[PDB]
């Protein structure tokens, strides 16, 4: 009512005074601080005229920068910090892959050797942390070690793990069932069935893991505050008073992860 | 000097007092939009008295985090994910060069390891992807491979192309027109003339491509997505 109107007026006066005092404090600093401004970083931007056609089931982390003509299949996911720069040539990311954290995918400008091809990634393919893929042509169900540095012209066959921290040189083909790593090609060993089972289970594990990150990163402000308050309320339990009051406290469904991601 | 830092601290005090008054006024009106988890990142983060200076004709990606005393030359590009940090000393970035995706430049923060060496980047230096230059000077018209690990005290002189995955040891100059690669950086061969032209060609094409992005990455905020985010 009128008391509410008066309180709103007092709130406006206090807000104005606080903003003025903030301005004065900023002036006293000598204007040596860069203002925060607003998040200008945008996912899925248009490079020249071509937009990235990303599927509905794909998880793209807000920190990622997927630009250029990028074609991403169903079930796959792009994680935080990753950059799918596709300005020059198309990047056909398959279905069921996972370009993991801080990974970079870039394509040469059709003239790195005269016969450049766009980067292509198959299905059920894991890339790993902070890998560098520059013009590779990964095919389906292949493992890439974290921190790998696949240069241009390389083709990795199915079930052909690249060791982590590798430096696969130009136009190097990795046969299916072989594990190549180190600064040179440097074949190590053959495949094992335990390892193929591990590859398949990790590939499916990241697919059934990505959806919780997709849901959490896409929650509205009016919803994230509610979840934060609920998590604060149910941070710790007390069976004593719960039993004494004749009540039971069950965690809300929105605070419980699906059983597929639990160990 | 010391006196300036005192005024900077008093500025923080007064700014926070005014900010708290603003929060009290907003909260008294029945609004809690100050509790959002907005990403508080600045692409030109500074310290007390560094304030990174960037040329107006240069292009810096929104994901780039230019921190410290970083100086950026004319026409150079600062791509997505690079972590150029120049707090202790100057980090001069040449005119026409480029710093690619997911790269960075140190200044060797800790002063324990001898004297801190400022980082110098020459003109038309095609710094590669995932470059981790650890406070080393780099002369003009040269190429740095992807995944290179240049360390402090290294003087990569003119046309000193550096192979991918290199780990050139500290205080080891790369001879002009000579490639060094492997673990550690060992002599491989001598630089050829077609690659000599290709270095400048790639620099020019990357500068033009950066100009194109800066033309298209400065587009207005497209409030359609702003309404999309709020309406959920």
């Amino acid at each position: 009512g009128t008391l509410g109107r008066a309180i709103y007026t007092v709130g406006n006066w206090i807000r104005g005074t606080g903003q003025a005092l903030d301005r004065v404090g900023s002036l006293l600093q000598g204007s040596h601080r860069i203002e925060e401004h607003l998040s200008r970083h945008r996912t899925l931007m248009n490079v020249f005229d071509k937009s990235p056609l990303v599927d509905k089931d794909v998880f793209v982390a807000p920190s990622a920068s997927v630009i250029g003509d990028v074609q991403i299949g169903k079930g796959s996911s792009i994680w935080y910090g990753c950059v799918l720069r596709g300005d020059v040539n198309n990047i056909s990311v398959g279905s069921g892959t996972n370009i993991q954290d801080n990974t970079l995918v870039h394509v040469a400008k059709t003239n790195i050797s005269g016969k450049v091809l766009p980067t292509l990634i198959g299905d059920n393919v894991t890339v790993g942390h902070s890998a560098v893929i520059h013009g590779c042509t990964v095919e389906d169900d292949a493992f890439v070690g974290m921190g790998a540095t696949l240069l241009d012209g390389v083709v990795v066959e199915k079930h052909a793990m690249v060791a982590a921290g590798s430096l696969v040189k130009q136009n190097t083909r990795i046969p299916s069932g072989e594990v190549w790593g180190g600064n040179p090609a440097k074949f190590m060993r053959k495949l094992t069935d335990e390892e193929i089972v591990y590859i398949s289970q990790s590939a499916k594990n990241y697919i059934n893991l990505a959806q919780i990150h997709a849901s959490e990163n896409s929650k509205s402000f009016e919803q994230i505050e509610v979840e934060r308050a609920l998590r604060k309320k149910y941070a710790r339990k007390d069976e004593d008073y719960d039993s004494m009051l004749g009540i039971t406290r069950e965690t809300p469904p929105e605070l419980i992860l699906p059983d597929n991601v639990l160990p | 000097g010391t006196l300036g830092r005192a005024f900077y601290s008093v500025g923080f005090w007064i700014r926070e007092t005014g900010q708290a008054l603003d929060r009290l006024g907003c909260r008294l009106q029945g609004k809690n939009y100050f509790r959002e988890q907005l990403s508080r990142h600045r692409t030109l983060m500074n310290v007390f008295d560094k304030a990174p200076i960037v040329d107006k004709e240069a292009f810096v990606a929104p994901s780039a985090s230019v921190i410290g005393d970083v100086h950026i030359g004319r026409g150079s590009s600062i791509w997505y994910g690079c972590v150029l940090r120049g707090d202790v000393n100057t980090v001069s970035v040449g005119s026409g060069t480029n710093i690619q995706d997911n790269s960075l430049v140190h200044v060797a923060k800790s002063n324990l390891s001898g004297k801190v060496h400022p980082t110098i980047i020459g003109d038309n230096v095609t710094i590669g992807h995932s470059a981790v230059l650890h406070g080393c000077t780099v002369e003009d018209e040269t190429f740095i491979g992807m995944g290179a690990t240049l360390l402090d005290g290294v003087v990569v002189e003119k046309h000193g192309m550096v192979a991918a995955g290199a780990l050139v040891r500290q205080n080891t100059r790369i001879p002009s027109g000579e490639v060094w690669g492997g673990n550690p950086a060992r002599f491989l061969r001598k630089l050829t003339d077609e690659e000599i032209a290709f270095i400048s060609q790639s620099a020019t094409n990357y500068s033009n491509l950066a100009q194109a992005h800066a033309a298209e990455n400065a587009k207005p905020l497209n409030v359609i997505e702003f309404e999309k985010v709020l309406r959920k």
Partner: peptide, 30 residues
């Protein structure tokens, strides 16, 4: 956007401000 529209917080706020006024008067009048 002209009224706080909360029939529970406003009484608390007026109680707080009258408490502040009472405190300043008690310091002054005594």
């Amino acid at each position: 956007p002209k009224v706080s529209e909360d029939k529970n917080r406003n009484y608390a706020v007026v109680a707080g401000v009258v408490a502040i006024v009472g405190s300043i008067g008690w310091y002054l009048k005594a």
